[PDB]
Design a protein around this ligand. Sequence first.
Ligand SMILES: CC(C)[C@H](CO)Nc1ncnc2[nH]ccc12
Length: 165
Amino acid sequence: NSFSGYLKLTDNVYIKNADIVEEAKKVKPTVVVNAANVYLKHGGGVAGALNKATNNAMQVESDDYIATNGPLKVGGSCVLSGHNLAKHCLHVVGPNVNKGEDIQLLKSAYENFNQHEVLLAPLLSAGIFGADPIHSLRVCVDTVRTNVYLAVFDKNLYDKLVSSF
Ligand SMILES: CC(C)[C@H](CO)Nc1ncnc2[nH]ccc12
């Protein structure tokens, strides 16, 4: 958990312009959050990037979790291995608002972070799930009570988030 170069936005939310994968390799945090879907199929966005950095070990473990437990619910989570990136990976499902899933579930999704004292995380529902990323940061700030270190790779978005905050 040796985080460097973050800006403190609130008492417990920090932000940095970085690829979450590079932050995980540098810090090896206790928990890295994945922006997952309900079947834990890590095909693109943050999920695809984290799985590729484990050389598909995350996907083989996720497929076994689904075989034994069934899919997660939107707003839900599960804790699996963090492989080479972290001690644990917290897979969290935000709503895919472009497919009509309710934006109210973005609060439920960020509530999962409160089970861990310190997390390295992306913005939920803010990639291909279609939610406005500045709205996602507002829900994060209003819901997470533990220490969250957010990594946002796109500099244009990072600058807009810092300016809005
Ligand atoms: C979620 C989305 C707004 C954001 C935009 O840069 N994506 C990411 N954020 C952080 N590390 C990442 N690695 C691969 C993608 C990615």
